Structure formats: structure tokens, C-alpha cells
């Protein structure tokens, strides 16, 4: 996981600093270790180690556990560090499904990790004060309503809270508070009757103490998987089937967990009743849609029962496998061409196949199909079974058949995407640091204008800013800006493929 460690190092250096990213990389590479050996291996001061650990545990990036002799062991979560790159997508989906209030709520929850309801509503009010104008003021009622609406939809979840120390062995306290979590109050909100109005940042007792919240990345991942499969079935059959599957997934969100081979049994009657009234579709047309989706060669849904009229079930693992197959064939087509993509789909459909059979079924002349096979084998996309006639396994007396292992292919593709995002971040930082002189020049020539904007604003300071030597260099600044924008967009785009690959990898894990 060298690429993962490098990406985590770059992200931590960009987001939190240098003295903390070293501790983070050490925790990721060496696993769980006590604070003493961490400070010994890192070679820095103890106070900086403590500050790094506290700022990491604040954002729920690392955790601590107790062991023999009461020693505390701190372990980092590389997956949690990788997930923080997906924050803009979380903010976008919470701004799409909700108003901008929930957007700011999730933004503050991600930028602070652990906070109380009063704190987050106060921060949202203070940030929205400058957004609106006309002297009016907002209250905490609508913010609390948006918060509880995010809570019941499981987008936000209460952080693991330390139990009552007075009732749990009142006396000598352990070195670690031993934070635990309860599923009862996981999405419950205690009543906060206090209200107020946010201040406009003029620059001129806690009822919800002990209760901290955080964005539930599991809900965001489930929602993104639902959106992906909806877009897939929309590109496949029609938008009507996409709406049907969106309604059934919305119904299944609550009654199912995040990891299950199939969803709960849903009948066509309740799906029709819960269907939005914007579509003038009858029950027979819905039954036809369901029975044609059941006959799909992709097997996204399944019957799995006949009671209750039309009983149907969806296949989460099969849908994720189909999405991974689509991603793999798309990247193969974009990397090697359409003919190599055809060869890949051929060798993927058939479990095992021979070179002459590949050329016959793919209809490609010699000296090219074998070249594509070799180019695809050199990139760890296929594997040779190599069934031997003799235990000597001599190449002259054995067969060779190509076979695509989707698991290893997805793993290597995820590694390639990680290294690609790392290289993009490195290139962005390089372009930023190589032009830091022009950046400081632009900053000073624009701060000459930023100062005395209103008080003491003479017009004689407007015809000399562009007179500097930075004027012929503005094209370089524009190129740097557009390059940074394109790099960020490419990283965010590869983030969706990373999420798809990670979901396909995790769905087949049983953790047994």
C-alpha cells in the first residue's frame, strides 16, 4: 500500500500540516503503537506528538484502545484518511438533497470532526449572516429542523460518547476514557429549546454537552452507489426503470444494512403506492417493467418469491460486479482501443479460451490479436491457468488459456488510481511552488488595492497596479489557475472511480 501511504501523506500535508502528517504516516505504516515509541521513532518533541494525536482524533482519523497493563495504543485508519478526499461530493449531495443549511452543516461537521448541535447551528448562522442581507435575521429553528432531518435520514450520526464515569466504577480513572457507542441514541437528538440570532461578524451552560456528531460516510457511500446503479439502469433501459429502482432503493434504505447480498422482499403493490404521483403509469406497466428487469441479462433484480402479487428483490453484489465490469471494459477501451476492448469482453464472457478461438470469436487477423493479448497480460489484467500435462510444467507440453480475474484487476486499478491522484497532487504542488514568486507579486499588487478600499481610497492608486512587471506575466497566472482547476477536476472525477472500485472490493468481503 505504498501508493495509499503516499496519497495519505500528501493529503495530510495539504490539509493539516507537516508536524502532524509525519505522525500520521508513522501510524499508517507501523500500525498501532503507544505514544512513547511513536515519539521515539519520529524523533520530535513530545508536545508536538500530543498535538498531532489530538488533532487527528478530533477529525475521527485515528482511534485509541486499551490493552494489558492499561497501556493505550493509537491506531490510524487509512480508509478514513482516504475518504476525506470525497468531502466535496458529500457537500454537493447534501446540498442537492437538502437546502444550503444542510450544506453548511455537513461542511462544518467535516471541517471540525466532532461538535455539538448548539455549536454547529451557531457556526451555520454565523456563516449565513454574511450570505444574506437587508437587515433581517435568521433563527435556530430551521437549522435544528434541517439537522434533525439529516439525523433521521442517517446522514449524520452521534460520535461514540464516553459512558457515565460516576456510575462506571467511581474511583481511580483509567488512562483512557474507553469511548463506547450505543445504537439507541445513534440518531437521536436531545431537545434544545434555546434559540438565537447569528451575528454578522462585526468584531465589535451547554445543554447538549457530551454529545458530538459526525458525518456518516456509510450513508453517503450507500447513496452514491444508489445513484450509480440508477444512472446505469437509466442508460440501459429507460428513465422510467431508473425512477422505479430509485423508489425501491429509497424504500430499502431503512429496512436494509450497508452490507447484504440482497435487499428485503418488496412487493409491487407497496412500490406502486410509494411511487411518486408525477408518473401516469398503471400497475400492469409496472409489472411489465419488473418482469423485463428480471429477464435482463445483467440480473440487477430477481423474483425471489411470488407472494403478495409481484414480489421482487434487487442484487447489490451483482449490480456492483456489473459496474466494475463496465468500468474495467471502459478503461481497457480507452487505454488500448475498441478492438482490444472487444477481445477483453470476449475473454471475460468465456471462462477459458484459446488464442485461435480468440481470433475466431473476435474476428481479428493474426499478428494483432496476440499482440493485444500480450499487452493486456503485461498489465496484470488477465491470468493464464496453465493446465499441465506433466508435473514438470514444461511450456512445450502444456496448454495456455486466458482468464480475467475481476478482483485482482479491480485492486490493481484502484492502486493505479491512487498513484494517479498522488501524481496529480504532486504536480499541482510543484506548479504552485515553482510560481510562488509570481504568486507573492500578485498578492502584493492586489493587497495594495485590498488595503484602503473604503477608508482613504484615492483614485491615484488605480493606474499604477497594472504598470508593474506582472502585466506580461498575467498569462502565466491564468495558465497556472486553469491547470490547477483541471487537476482538481481530474482528481474529483477519479474519486468516483475510486469509490466504485472500493465498493466492489468491499462488497465481496465477509470479514470472517
Amino acid at each position: 500500500t505504498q501508493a495509499e501511504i503516499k496519497l495519505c501523506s500528501l493529503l495530510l500535508q495539504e490539509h493539516f500540516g507537516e508536524i502532524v502528517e509525519k505522525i500520521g504516516v508513522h501510524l499508517i505504516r507501523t500500525g498501532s503503537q503507544p505514544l512513547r515509541v511513536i515519539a521515539h521513532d519520529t524523533g520530535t518533541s513530545l508536545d508536538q506528538v500530543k498535538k498531532a494525536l489530538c488533532v487527528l482524533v478530533q477529525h475521527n482519523l485515528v482511534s485509541y484502545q486499551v490493552h494489558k497493563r492499561g497501556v493505550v495504543e493509537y491506531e490510524a485508519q487509512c480508509s478514513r484518511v482516504l475518504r476525506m478526499l470525497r468531502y466535496p461530493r458529500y457537500i454537493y449531495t447534501t446540498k442537492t438533497l437538502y437546502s444550503d443549511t444542510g450544506e453548511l452543516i455537513v461542511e462544518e461537521l467535516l471541517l471540525n470532526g466532532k461538535l455539538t448541535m448548539s455549536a454547529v447551528v451557531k457556526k451555520v448562522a454565523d456563516r449565513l449572516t454574511e450570505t444574506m442581507e437587508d437587515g433581517k435575521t435568521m433563527d435556530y429553528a430551521e437549522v435544528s429542523n434541517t439537522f434533525v432531518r439529516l439525523a433521521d435520514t442517517h446522514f449524520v450520526q452521534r460520535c461514540p460518547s464516553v459512558p457515565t464515569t460516576e456510575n462506571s466504577d467511581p474511583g481511580p480513572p483509567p488512562p483512557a476514557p474507553t469511548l463506547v457507542i450505543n445504537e439507541k441514541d445513534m440518531y437521536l437528538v436531545p431537545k434544545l429549546s434555546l434559540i438565537g440570532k447569528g451575528k454578522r461578524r462585526r468584531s465589535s451552560p451547554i445543554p447538549d454537552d457530551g454529545i458530538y456528531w459526525q458525518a456518516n460516510l456509510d450513508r453517503f457511500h450507500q447513496h452514491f452507489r444508489d445513484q450509480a446503479i440508477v444512472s446505469a439502469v437509466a442508460n440501459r433501459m429507460d428513465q422510467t426503470s431508473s425512477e422505479i429502482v430509485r423508489t425501491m432503493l429509497r424504500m430499502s434504505e431503512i429496512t436494509t444494512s450497508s452490507s447484504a447480498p440482497f435487499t428485503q422482499p418488496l412487493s409491487s403493490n407497496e412500490i406502486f403506492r410509494s411511487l411518486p404521483v408525477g408518473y401516469n403509469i398503471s400497475k400492469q406497466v409496472l409489472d411489465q417493467y419488473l418482469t423485463l428487469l428480471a429477464d435482463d441479462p445483467l440480473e440487477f433484480v430477481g423474483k425471489s418469491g411470488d407472494s403478495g402479487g409481484g414480489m421482487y428483490v434487487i442484487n447489490l453484489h451483482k449490480a456492483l460486479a456489473s459496474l466494475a465490469t463496465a468500468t474495467l471494459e471502459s478503461v481497457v477501451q480507452e487505454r488500448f482501443g475498441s478492438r482490444c476492448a472487444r477481445i477483453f469482453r470476449l475473454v471475460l464472457q468465456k471462462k477459458h479460451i484459446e488464442q485461435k478461438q480468440v481470433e475466431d470469436f473476435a474476428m481479428i487477423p493474426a499478428k494483432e490479436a496476440k499482440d493485444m493479448l500480450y499487452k493486456m497480460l503485461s498489465e496484470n489484467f488477465m491470468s493464464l491457468q496453465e493446465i499441465p500435462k506433466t508435473p514438470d510444467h514444461a511450456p512445450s507440453r502444456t496448454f495456455y488459456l486466458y482468464t480475467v480475474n475481476i478482483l485482482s484487476a479491480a485492486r490493481m486499478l484502484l492502486h493505479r488510481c491512487y498513484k494517479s491522484i498522488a501524481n496529480l497532487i504532486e504536480r499541482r504542488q510543484f506548479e504552485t511552488k515553482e510560481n510562488k514568486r509570481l504568486l507573492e507579486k500578485s498578492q502584493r499588487v492586489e493587497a495594495i488595492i485590498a488595503s484602503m478600499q473604503a477608508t482613504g481610497a484615492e483614485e491615484a492608486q488605480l493606474q499604477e497596479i497594472e504598470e508593474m512587471i506582472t502585466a506580461p506575466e498575467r498569462q502565466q497566472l491564468e495558465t497556472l489557475k486553469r491547470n490547477v482547476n483541471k487537476l482538481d477536476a481530474s482528481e474529483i472525477q477519479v474519486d468516483e472511480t475510486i469509490f466504485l472500485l472500493e465498493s466492489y472490493i468491499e462488497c465481496t468481503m465477509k470479514r470472517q
Partner: protein, 86 residues
């Protein structure tokens, strides 16, 4: 029999295929705007702990005028183990 090459392959071999143009729309524009805003606003937060400057030259009268003063967040020591108190 393969012929002998008098020049090693270039450091950047050319490929006839090019990257697909990036997706456009209000979505990607909002992505860029939000990512830049986060990158900007996260550096001044107290969570972003910069390296402590050292080898301070001298103390001057205008130090209090240029002293970098920022609000310091107090971590909840009830949730944090006792081994991190400064």
C-alpha cells in the same frame, strides 16, 4: 532476427490514444469552487498546526503589533486520554 537500435527509447513514448476530455457542467464548476474554498479556509483554522518558527532573531517593540494571535480550540479532555495534556 530483431535489428539493433542505436538510440534508447525516449523517456516519454507517444501513444495514439489521448485522455477523454473532462466532464463539464455546473457540477464540476461547483466541485472546483468548493475544493478551492476548502483549501483556502482550512489553512487558517486552528486544526492546521503550522511548524513552530525557531531561531528568533530578536524581540522588537512592534512584536505585539505583529504577534500572530489566533483563537485556540480546547480539545475535550473527557474524550481524550490523559497522556496528551501539555
Amino acid at each position: 532476427l530483431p535489428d539493433v537500435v542505436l538510440k534508447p527509447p525516449p523517456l516519454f513514448p507517444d501513444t495514439d490514444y489521448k485522455p477523454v476530455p473532462l466532464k463539464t457542467g455546473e457540477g464540476e464548476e461547483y466541485m472546483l469552487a468548493l475544493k478551492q474554498e476548502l483549501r483556502e479556509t482550512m489553512k487558517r483554522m486552528p486544526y492546521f498546526i503550522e511548524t513552530p518558527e525557531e531561531r528568533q532573531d530578536i524581540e522588537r517593540y512592534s512584536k505585539r503589533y505583529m504577534k500572530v494571535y489566533k483563537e485556540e480550540w480546547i480539545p475535550d479532555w473527557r474524550r481524550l486520554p490523559r497522556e496528551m495534556m501539555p
